[PDB]
From Swiss-Prot:
Catalytic reactions of this protein: hydrogencarbonate + H(+) = CO2 + H2O; urea = cyanamide + H2O
Gene Ontology MF annotations: arylesterase activity; carbonate dehydratase activity; cyanamide hydratase activity; zinc ion binding
UniProt site positions, description: Involved in the binding of some activators, including histamine and L-histidine: 90
Enzyme class label: lyase
Effect seen on changing residue 140 to G: Weakly impaired activity
Species this chain originates from: Homo sapiens (Human)
Phenotype upon changing residue 65 to L: Reduced activity
Domain Alpha-carbonic anhydrase: 1-257
Designated name of the protein: Carbonic anhydrase 2
Gene: CA2
Residues marked Fine-tunes the proton-transfer properties of H-64 (site): 5, 60, 65
Subunit structure: Interacts with SLC4A4. Interaction with SLC4A7 regulates SLC4A7 transporter activity. Interacts with SLC26A6 isoform 4 (via C-terminus cytoplasmic domain).
Consequence of substituting residue 65 to H: Enhanced proton transfer
Binding of Zn(2+), residues: 92, 94, 117
Illness: Osteopetrosis, autosomal recessive 3: A rare genetic disease characterized by abnormally dense bone, due to defective resorption of immature bone. Osteopetrosis occurs in two forms: a severe autosomal recessive form occurring in utero, infancy, or childhood, and a benign autosomal dominant form occurring in adolescence or adulthood. Recessive osteopetrosis commonly manifests in early infancy with macrocephaly, feeding difficulties, evolving blindness and deafness, bone marrow failure, severe anemia, and hepatosplenomegaly.
Length: 258
């Protein structure tokens, strides 16, 4: 009876195994755009993904994860609110059963169809496993997805999903360029938070881009053909794999713009 995204094991139950679920800096949150403080001291975000090297793709029963070779100083996030340099390790998405829900963060209560998380670890802690034990260990770049015109840079992902339909399946997935997942503008909101899945560690500086990417109805319909279950178990479609907004508590969300 492990954690998941149903009635008996979903977000409202996670606190029993992971009591930090009711902590002071949990994610995601609603971003109240009026309340967010413009911070002129914030820097432009530096995203340097030209040398990113992807390794594979896995359905872990919770999402699909595209994992990168992070053993050299390649694909790095820096600037913005960050001190030092954070190296890309993986990305994944959260999405809904319908286009009107799926994102983790919300913007003035608006839910997007999905949300992409690019996960990076602070190089000062040597690898991801040590970084998650630190308050400034991770930087996650979050990008909203709305449904409209296709995202041509997503299609290579979408077309491999058929090979990783069920929990535990993986594939080789090389030469995927995550620059094709970025919107035009790097304007962002930032605040201190957590992983959005167990173990819910409070290790993340969140950087959430204001401009969403557009993906097509057909692209998100293929996300919703994945399964939570393993091969040969009753089919439960992988949909609604998002945590709802959590209390903001002490925190201030800062804006890089306006
Ligand atoms: C914020 N979204 S999340 O679901 O909590 C999440 C993941 F799914 C991840 F896969 C990772 S990286 C896991 C391999 N290094 C992560 F840091 C992470 F934060
Ligand atoms: Na840069
Ligand atoms: Zn995530």
């Amino acid at each position: 009876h492990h954690w998941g995204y149903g009635k008996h094991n979903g977000p409202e139950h996670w606190h029993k195994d992971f009591p930090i679920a009711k902590g002071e800096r949990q994610s995601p949150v609603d971003i109240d755009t009026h309340t967010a403080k413009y911070d002129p001291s914030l820097k432009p975000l530096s995203v340097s993904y030209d040398q990113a090297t992807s390794l594979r793709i896995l359905n872990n029963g919770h999402a699909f994860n595209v994992e990168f070779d992070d053993s050299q100083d390649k694909a790095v996030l820096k600037g913005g609110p960050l001190d030092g340099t954070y190296r890309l390790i993986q990305f994944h998405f959260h999405w809904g059963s319908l286009d009107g829900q799926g994102s983790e963060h919300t913007v003035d209560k608006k839910k997007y169809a999905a949300e992409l998380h690019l996960v990076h670890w602070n190089t000062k802690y040597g690898d991801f496993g040590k970084a998650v034990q630190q308050p400034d260990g991770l930087a996650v770049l979050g990008i909203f997805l709305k449904v409209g015109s296709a995202k041509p840079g997503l299609q290579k992902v979408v077309d491999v999903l058929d090979s990783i339909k069920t929990k535990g399946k993986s594939a080789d997935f090389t030469n995927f360029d995550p620059r094709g997942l970025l919107p035009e503008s790097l304007d962002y909101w930032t605040y201190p938070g957590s992983l959005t899945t167990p173990p819910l560690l409070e290790c993340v500086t969140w950087i959430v881009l204001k401009e969403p990417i557009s993906v097509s109805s057909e692209q998100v319909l293929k996300f919703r053909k994945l399964n939570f279950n393993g091969e040969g178990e009753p089919e439960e479609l992988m949909v609604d794999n998002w945590r709802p907004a959590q209390p903001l508590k002490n925190r201030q969300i800062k804006a890089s713009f306006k």
